[PDB]
C-alpha cells in the first residue's frame, strides 16, 4: 500500500522532537 511518501510520516513521528527542536512548528 505504498501510496507515496510512505516514509516521511515515520520521519516526522520519530524525528518529532528533533523536528520541533530544529524547526519550530
Report the chain's terminal Cα–Cα distance, integer Å. 29
For residue 19, give every residue at least 6 positions away whose Cβ sits within 8 Å of its Cβ, in sequence order, or none: 12
Q: Which approach determined this entry?
A: NMR
Distance CA(7)–CA(21), nearest Å, equals 20
Distance CA(25)–CA(22), nearest Å, equals 9
Nearest of 10, 2, 11 to residue 23 by alpha carbon: 11
User: Counting Cβ atoms within 10 Å, is residue 16 exposed (0-12), middle (13-18) or buried (19+)?
Assistant: exposed
Alpha-carbon torsion (14, 17, 22, 24), positive or negative: positive
Q: Residue 22 has which C-alpha cell? A: 530544529
Amino acid at each position: 500500500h505504498v501510496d507515496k511518501k510512505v516514509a516521511d510520516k515515520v520521519l516526522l513521528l520519530k524525528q518529532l522532537r528533533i523536528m520541533r527542536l530544529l524547526t519550530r512548528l
